[PDB]
Amino acid sequence: KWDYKNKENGPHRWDKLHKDFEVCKSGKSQSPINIEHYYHTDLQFKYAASKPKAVFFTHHTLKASFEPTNHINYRGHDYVLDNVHFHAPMEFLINNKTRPLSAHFVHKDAKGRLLVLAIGFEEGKENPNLDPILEGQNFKEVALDAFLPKSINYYHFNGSLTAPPCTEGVAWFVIEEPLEVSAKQLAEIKKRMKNSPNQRPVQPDYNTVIIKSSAETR
Amino acid sequence: KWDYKNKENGPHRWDKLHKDFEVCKSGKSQSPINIEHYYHTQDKADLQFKYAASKPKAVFFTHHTLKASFEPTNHINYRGHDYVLDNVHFHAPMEFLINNKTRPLSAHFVHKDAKGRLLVLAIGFEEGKENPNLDPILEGIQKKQNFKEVALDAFLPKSINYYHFNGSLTAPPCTEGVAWFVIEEPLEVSAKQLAEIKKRMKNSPNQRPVQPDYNTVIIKSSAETR
Ligand SMILES: Cn1nc(S(N)(=O)=O)s/c1=N\S(=O)(=O)c1ccc(C(C)(C)C)cc1
Ligand SMILES: Cn1nc(S(N)(=O)=O)s/c1=N\S(=O)(=O)c1ccc(C(C)(C)C)cc1
Ligand SMILES: [Zn+2]
Ligand SMILES: [Zn+2]
């Protein structure tokens, strides 16, 4: 049972717990990393009001799953949202800028490739998109179509899962725009993960090629 | 033992030659691939060249290809990370595909920083004219010791467009984490130059078949070598 704690099952010792998990140690394109040097420079969305198929804290974090009806298109391939989960703190560093929460929209295409999306949260206003996840027969829909800023700066690169098995072949898009969140929610969420911090330390970057581009979500 | 003949030694089947080659099949950032989707960008003046025409420490054929070794007097500085040209070896045909474009030959400029980091600099060859940079090489297989010079600063183009991404070495152990600069511009090679090296590789095609892409982020940009 791998964990994020400072002991033996910790992030630094993940490869020597299971053997599929060597990649947490042997990989060169491991996520997360500190994004500070990048190059400035085809994304489509099928996000809609969706009922989470399930909501739960799992494998050390809180997570919401989804019916395979909501998609993202990249390179002419629909990737399917399974779930979106949370990390506190934010796993990814943006030019040494830190946020108290991020969220990962995890997707998969027909070939098999994963495409995940990360965005930051800054402390602030009460964020109404969070309640149906915090609320987990008659499941209330979640506003996937209203979650992200209409205008978004993203960073895109090739990386890894940030929790075991640290599988590679993941397309990372990380948004520079933060989603504001009131502090009562943050405290409430940090504790739905057992007041235990689920952030992987920055992994080695061996000059990951990153693009900065922009898009309109809706 | 590993070769391109689709027997026991075939190229995807590399993982089963050494278990050192497991990344050759299990790897996610594997080269070569079709350079067909990419990002147009600028020049932050990142990659710089202080190359010079230099005499090889040794010339020899190795591991299904021709290769030349070099003194650490020649370096590449990039983003504050200096690499040493270690050697130059060849592939016919070219392994990386440029917009689905096929070249009859490549050459790989291998670089190394103090670390384990790799930097390969690849450029193509098409049928045609005599390659004056190559002319000093086919005479280089007839000799040891004082090998004939390579006009290496006269090898590459004065002005250069490349494609850049993180990939792997293209031959076993198929090591990933290799910074690829792939040049679209071809150098020319005579059919005489074309035919003779293929026999120094036994007319045996030494190209790793195209690997799966996991949405590899590639940028297209340009620079000056000379
Ligand atoms: C363990 N892990 N880490 C992640 S991160 N933080 O890099 O986005 S996602 C994850 N596991 S997961 O989201 O439940 C998941 C992993 C793999 C799949 C498939 C589609 C089977 C490849 C589907 C869901
Ligand atoms: C295995 N291999 N693959 C290559 S390709 N086709 O991706 O450019 S070059 C190669 N082997 S090699 O050029 O002799 C070599 C030279 C130097 C090193 C280091 C260990 C970095 C000094 C490692 C391998
Ligand atoms: Zn995550
Ligand atoms: Zn090569």
Facing A28 at nearest CB: one of B39, B42, B176? B176
Whether the CB-CB separation of B176 and B23 falls below 8 Å is answered with yes
Question: B30, B63, B169, B182: which to mutate for ligand 2, most atoms within 8 A of CB?
Answer: B169
Q: Residues with Cβ < 8 Å from B171, sequence gap 6 or more?
A: B63, B64, B208
Is the minimum distance from the CB of A108 to ligand 1 under 6 angstroms? yes
Measured in degrees and rounded to the nearest 5, phi and psi for residue A189 equal -80, -35
The minimum-distance atom of ligand 1 relative to the CA of A162 is 7
- For atom 4 of ligand 2, which residue has the closest CA? B169
A169/B contact by beta carbon, under 8 A: yes
Which residue in A94, A123, A101 sits closest to A199, CA to CA? A101
The minimum-distance atom of ligand 2 relative to the CA of B65 is 6
Is the minimum distance from the CB of B108 to ligand 2 under 6 angstroms? yes
CATH of B1-226 given 2.40.110.10, 3.30.1360.70, 3.10.200.10, 3.30.2350.10? 3.10.200.10
| Nearest Cα residue in chain B from A205 | B177
Neighbours of ion ligand 4 (CB under 5 A): B 108
Q: Which residues of A touch B177 (CB under 8 A)?
A: 28-29, 206
Q: Do B166 and A211 touch (CB under 8 A)?
A: no
Q: Do B217 and A40 touch (CB under 8 A)?
A: no
Give strand ranges (E) for A144-210: 151-160, 168-181
What was the experiment behind these coordinates? X-ray
Residues B87 and B101: their CA atoms lie apart, in Å, by 26
Which residue in B69, B64, B118, B112 sits closest to B91, CA to CA? B64
The CA angle B62-B65-B66, to the nearest 5 degrees, is 80
Resolution in units of Å: 2.9
Residues A154 and A135: their CA atoms lie apart, in Å, by 29
Tokens of A129: 């998109």
> What does each C-alpha distance from A117 to A104, A163, B14 come to in angstroms?
5, 15, 34
Choosing from A12, A18, A60, A107, the catalytic residue is A60
CATH of A1-218 given 3.30.70.2860, 3.10.105.10, 3.30.230.10, 3.10.200.10? 3.10.200.10
Distance from chain centroid for Cα B205: 15
Q: What letter represents residue A173's amino acid? A: F
| Parallel/antiparallel/unpaired status of strands A168-181 and A114-123 | parallel
The minimum-distance atom of ligand 1 relative to the CA of A159 is 7
**H helix runs in A32-176, sequence order:** 131-134
> Domain-by-domain residue ranges, chain B?
1-226
Which residue in B108, B46, B34 sits closest to B79, CA to CA? B46
Which residue, among A211, A212, A213, would best test binding to B if mutated, counting the most B CBs under 10 Å from its CB?
A: A211
**Distance to chain A for B56, nearest Cα, Å:** 29
Q: What is the largest CA-CA distance in chain A?
A: 48
Interface of B with A in 118-157 (CB under 8 A): none
Whether the CB-CB separation of A50 and A67 falls below 8 Å is answered with yes
Query: How many CB atoms lie under 10 A from the CB of residue B142?
Result: 9
